[PDB]
Write a protein that binds this DNA or RNA. Structure first.
Ligand SMILES: N=C(N)c1ccc(Oc2ccc(-c3nc4cc(C(=N)N)ccc4[nH]3)cc2)cc1
Ligand SMILES: N=C(N)c1ccc(Oc2ccc(-c3nc4cc(C(=N)N)ccc4[nH]3)cc2)cc1
Lengths: 255, 255
DNA sequence: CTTAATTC
DNA sequence: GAATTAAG
DNA sequence: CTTAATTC
DNA sequence: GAATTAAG
């Protein structure tokens, strides 16, 4: 009943996340950067109809808000199979080129796993849902990610932008990893005998016994829920001696 | 009257050369080499008519002789401007690949000229005509360079081959340089105060005074003539303080 | 005429 | 990978 | 739809 | 240099 014991921690039962302890992020631009406004390539009705539901959902969630900005980047008619799942994909390359670089602090999977001791063979893997959207963007940095949205049948005035850390932004993974690391520092301190590996939104908790893993997982879920993050209950691998993490299969202390 | 004083040394007055002091060359094959017989691509009448005179001249000079050989390489319809000067060009690449490698002892022009002292500013440049043809090929190595020659109007049976070091053979330049160096060793010994640079068939004699250059050039021409080599009287640059050698212009001690 | 390398 | 060179 | 890289 | 990839 992991699902029922922690209603707030699961994305399926706790509503959209919001890292309440994290201050809205301010995105520094390179010293010579000036806003760039790239025109939106005309989108076909089919692509527009596919994307529409997502845009409305995000507007309802307050993740997207109307705005007028000197910045503008293109939205793409992206999918995968044939012409389904039209999730909106923003081409933020011209924005990324004007944003100041930050040190890449997210360790590569290989080195991250090196920190997994043979002594801890009871694992719990969790992946946070819509992780980036949990981090607020400071109002001053919001205009930077604006894009155009039109509804030929009288819909929206013009531009919309993100109030949360967006997908496609070059520093989103790193900024999210650093945050969360900050939010989970106390948990690590409260559970010295537990191993916690973090790779952006993918978490691995390792314990020496099934009990400790159970007690540790309870604590982690409780903490994540309270902080405003949400884990996928569907994909959760709880207290297993064999789990799939970052492309590896952890078994018998191997990999 | 350099031309009249040394009839035997100039190609224009001494007949074809023949290095009488040099033993016929034997060309060692790689340890696993076996003869290769490449078919002659059909040659058009125009190409055949252009090449014909050269082949006959060489046969008359004994430089080319009939033969039957398990080796055979192609003759090419080579020219330059449009369809003139049809000098025979043999593709000896499959023969070169089967001949044992030798150390490249011919110095590059740059290093060779480094041996030209500022003290010697009176130059004489000579280039030997048909240098390679002056070196005899041992009968045992002759079959290696065979090619096909036909005269639709009943001319030659089949193959012809060289009795002299041929053009297109990978070791001809080096073998010629080494020979000649051997033939001119005494001259260097008899003229210690003279500088003699050799680059295959291109010679540069350098002296400190116009007189020494005159006396030295006389001696060199006499020696070359007696040994069986022939210098181009037309291109000869005699006792000049400015001469063109190996692409460089030697002047005021420069280059 | 082939063939090995260099460009685009 | 189809032109373009360079060279025997 | 772009755009930067990789192949052939 | 024209395809083919990969990715925002
Ligand atoms: N596809 C196209 N339109 C074009 C393709 C190629 C182009 O240029 C060039 C093609 C070939 C060379 C070039 N080729 C060689 C071959 C050499 C050898 N191995 N003998 C030795 C040196 C050398 N230089 C130099 C430049 C220009 C245009
Ligand atoms: N001319 C032709 N018929 C062909 C041309 C190209 C062919 O293959 C390939 C083409 C392109 C790739 C390839 N392209 C990329 C682009 C990358 C990027 N910068 N996002 C990152 C990694 C990557 N791999 C790999 C193989 C096959 C056939």
């Amino acid at each position: 009943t992991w699902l029922s014991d922690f209603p707030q921690a699961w994305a399926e039962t706790g509503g959209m996340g919001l890292a309440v302890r994290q201050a809205p992020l301010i995105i520094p631009l390179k010293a010579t950067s000036t806003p760039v406004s790239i025109k939106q390539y005309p989108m076909s009705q089919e692509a527009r109809l596919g994307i529409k539901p997502h845009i409305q959902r995000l507007l309802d969630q307050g993740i997207l808000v109307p705005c007028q900005s000197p910045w503008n980047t293109p939205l793409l008619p992206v999918k995968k199979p044939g012409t389904n799942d039209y999730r909106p994909v923003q081409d933020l390359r011209e924005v990324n080129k004007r944003v100041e670089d930050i040190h890449p602090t997210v360790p590569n999977p290989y080195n991250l796993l090196s920190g997994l001791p043979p002594s801890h063979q009871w694992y719990t893997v969790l992946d946070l849902k819509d992780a980036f959207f949990c981090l607020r963007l400071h109002p001053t940095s919001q205009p930077l990610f604006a894009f155009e949205w039109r509804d030929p049948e009288m819909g929206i005035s013009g531009q919309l932008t993100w109030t949360r850390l967006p997908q496609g932004f070059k520093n989103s993974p790193t900024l999210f990893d650093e945050a969360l690391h900050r939010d989970l520092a106390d948990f690590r301190i409260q559970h010295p005998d537990l191993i916690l590996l973090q790779y952006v939104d993918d978490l691995l908790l390792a314990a020496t016994s099934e009990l400790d893993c159970q007690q540790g997982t309870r604590a982690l879920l409780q903490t994540l829920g309270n902080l405003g993050y949400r884990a996928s209950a569907k994909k959760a691998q709880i207290c297993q001696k064999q789990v799939k993490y970052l492309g590896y299969l952890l078994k018998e202390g191997q990999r």
